[PDB]
Design a protein around this ligand. Structure first.
Ligand SMILES: Cc1cc(=O)[nH]c(=O)n1[C@@H]1O[C@H](COP(=O)(O)O)[C@@H](O)[C@H]1O
Ligand SMILES: Cc1cc(=O)[nH]c(=O)n1[C@@H]1O[C@H](COP(=O)(O)O)[C@@H](O)[C@H]1O
Lengths: 215, 215
């Protein structure tokens, strides 16, 4: 990922989302698009962004259903042009395998979300996260998401998945995570509001990149 | 819910989804619409169904993000005309509260998914399910989802939530659950493929209702 920075584009208006993404395009080459934008503007927004910006698109859909439904969700998401999809591991191995099967059929990638970044993640997810990660390894998952807000947990996730696996990390900026510390363990950081709510998103992205190059 | 039966409309084509829903409308008055249909046909499908069929719509979006994103997802879903949304409890109390806050602002309902119906649910979700349910009670959740495939677990969920709470249950038919047994504990059953993949969906729905009235 260009500059190890992934934009979390969670504005809910097509015009604002296009404006911000265009302003920061030189600093990124991967955009994470989730349900706030998709449920407001339609799945066609994925192919529009892919074309206009020539970026890779990660669909952050936190897929968390039974295996049969997960297959349908993944098929629709890849048909819409997403390069990868984020999948929850908490629903278990069969649900993750269903997503892996569709990604294999369509030449795409799955990212497994193993521990979340918000405070509530401590209640149930944290205590399962190591086992969710190990499940990922045993299923052959190569791409993972873990939390910038808890770098000791990010270190433990990296320990389980090994150095060859790709690890991206949200919670930088707004949720309190630090870019440099997070990049001790993650390959790339995800940043949303610290960029897209800034008075000058390009200057915000540049500031982050400047602190990244210093590592 | 009319006849204690909720149609899980997970066909991915608007014409087929409209045909089946129209054929079974006399047997139901609540349609559950999820991401297979929404990500294939757009969020506008919710208002279309609500109008054409005069049904209640439950958006089965298994909301499972951080609190800030959950608020955006719920706002977009209610703006699209959904009467209620299904929310995962596994991400913790703050994530569930975010959904409850938006439902309160917009005069809608949250259904909390506490234990899932597929085999993988045994790995991580089952061991947290009682505590997820108790969390729901403490947050004031009044609507719950639990698994037809494990009626002993459905009984335990009913025990925690009490008789006044509303409980709906998927996994009937295709996944192996039984309508009558499930309705010992749930107020309503969700049925998808046993109806929408049948040669005659109306006859399939009628058959289920006939076995329900017998209780
Ligand atoms: C992928 C994900 C997992 C998670 O544990 N935490 C998280 O924030 N996310 C998403 O990353 C983005 C974080 O954005 P900011 O906090 O930087 O605004 C939002 O899209 C969240 O939904
Ligand atoms: C709500 C939900 C939770 C869950 O634990 N199990 C489940 O099947 N679902 C959904 O119910 C429906 C079950 O459909 P059939 O198995 O009856 O086809 C699908 O939409 C599933 O995504």
């Amino acid at each position: 990922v260009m500059n190890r920075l992934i934009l979390a584009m969670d504005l809910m208006n097509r015009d604002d989302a296009l404006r911000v993404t265009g302003e920061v395009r030189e600093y990124i080459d991967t955009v994470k698009i989730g349900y706030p934008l998709v449920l407001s503007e339609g799945m066609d927004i994925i192919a529009e962004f892919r074309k206009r910006f020539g970026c890779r698109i990660i669909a952050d859909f936190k897929v968390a259903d039974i295996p049969e439904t997960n297959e349908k969700i993944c098929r629709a998401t890849f048909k819409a042009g997403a390069d990868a999809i984020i999948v929850h591991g908490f629903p278990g191995a069969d649900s993750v395998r269903a997503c892996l099967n569709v990604a294999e059929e369509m030449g795409r990638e799955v990212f497994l979300l193993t521990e979340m970044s918000h405070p509530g993640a401590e209640m149930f997810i944290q205590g399962a996260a190591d086992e969710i990660a190990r499940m990922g390894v045993d299923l052959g998952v190569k791409n993972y998401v873990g939390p910038s807000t808890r770098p000791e947990r990010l270190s433990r996730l990296r320990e389980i998945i090994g150095q060859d696996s790709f690890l991206i990390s949200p919670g930088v900026g707004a949720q309190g995570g630090d870019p440099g510390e997070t990049l001790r363990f993650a390959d790339a950081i995800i940043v949303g509001r610290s960029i897209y709510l800034a008075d000058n998103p390009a200057a915000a992205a540049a500031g982050i990149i400047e602190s990244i190059k210093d590592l």
